[PDB]
C-alpha cells in the first residue's frame, strides 16, 4: 500500500515518547509548594505539561508554523481539550488494559481506585473514555490514522472563526483526503473505517466538553503571574 505524503510528514514530526515522558516527569518531580489538595495538583501540572508538548508539536507542524500568531492562538484555543483527550485515548489503546489507565508519566491508575476517590463527574468521564478506547481498539486505529486525526483536530475550526481562511481550509481538505486514502489502501476489508474514524471525533469532542465542565467546577483562581497554560486556555473567551 502507499502512504499519503502528509502522513509521512506527520510521522517525522512525532516526538519520541520517552523524551516527552522524561521532560514531563522532570517538571513534576520538582520540590513542590503547599494551593489545591493532592492528588489534583500533581495531575493538573501533568496535563499542563502534556499540553506544552502538544503546543511544541504544533509549532513544528507544516501549515501551522506559517499562520499568524493570532490564528495559531485561535486554533489551539478551539482544540486543546480534544488534543489532550485524543492523546489520552490513544495512550490507552496502545496500553490495552481494561482494569487500569496509563498516564503520560508511565504511572498506572486502577479503575477501582477511581471508583472510590473520584467524584461522579470525573468517574463517569473516565469510564466513558474507556468505552471509546474499546471502540477504537476494535477498529484497529493505528499510528498513521492517529497522527492524521491529531492534525485534523488541530485544524478543526470552521475557517470563519479565523482571519485567514485560505491556508487552514486547504489543510482541512488535504488531511481529510489523506485519511480516506490511507484507510482505503491499508484497510480495504473494513468498508467505512474512514467514516467510523470521523464519527470517533464526535465522541472525542463530547468527552472534551465534559472534561472542561469538570475543570470549571473546580473554580480555579487566576494567577499572579500566570504559571499554568491550561488555566489560561480554560478561562480564555471567544
Amino acid at each position: 500500500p502507499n502512504v499519503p505524503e502528509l502522513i509521512l510528514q506527520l510521522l517525522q514530526l512525532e516526538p519520541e515518547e520517552d523524551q516527552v515522558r522524561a521532560r514531563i516527569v522532570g517538571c513534576l518531580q520538582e520540590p513542590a509548594k503547599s494551593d489545591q489538595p493532592a492528588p489534583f495538583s500533581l495531575l493538573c501540572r501533568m496535563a499542563d505539561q502534556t499540553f506544552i508538548s502538544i503546543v511544541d508539536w504544533a509549532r513544528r507542524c507544516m501549515v501551522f508554523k506559517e499562520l499568524e500568531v493570532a490564528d495559531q492562538m485561535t486554533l489551539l484555543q478551539n482544540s486543546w481539550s480534544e488534543l489532550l483527550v485524543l492523546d489520552h485515548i490513544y495512550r490507552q489503546v496502545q496500553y490495552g488494559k481494561e482494569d487500569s489507565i496509563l498516564l503520560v508519566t508511565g504511572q498506572e491508575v486502577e479503575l477501582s481506585t477511581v471508583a472510590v476517590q473520584a467524584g461522579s463527574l470525573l468517574h463517569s468521564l473516565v469510564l466513558r473514555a474507556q468505552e471509546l478506547v474499546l471502540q477504537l481498539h476494535a477498529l484497529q486505529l493505528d499510528r498513521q490514522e492517529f497522527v492524521c486525526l491529531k492534525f485534523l483536530i488541530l485544524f478543526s475550526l470552521d475557517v470563519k472563526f479565523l482571519n485567514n481562511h485560505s491556508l487552514v481550509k486547504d489543510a482541512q481538505e488535504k488531511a481529510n483526503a489523506a485519511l480516506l486514502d490511507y484507510t482505503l489502501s491499508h484497510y480495504p476489508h473494513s468498508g467505512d473505517k474512514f467514516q467510523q474514524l470521523l464519527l470517533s471525533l464526535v465522541e472525542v469532542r463530547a468527552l472534551s466538553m465534559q472534561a472542561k465542565e469538570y475543570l470549571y467546577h473546580k473554580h480555579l483562581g487566576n494567577e499572579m503571574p500566570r504559571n499554568n497554560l491550561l488555566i489560561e486556555m480554560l478561562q480564555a473567551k471567544q
Binding site: 503546543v55 509549532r59 500568531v69 495559531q72 492562538m73 489551539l76 484555543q77 500566570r226 499554568n228 489560561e232
Partner: peptide, 10 residues
C-alpha cells in the same frame, strides 16, 4: 499576560 502567545513566539 499570555502564556500561550509567549510560547508561540519563543
Amino acid at each position: 499576560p499570555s502564556l500561550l502567545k509567549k510560547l508561540l513566539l519563543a
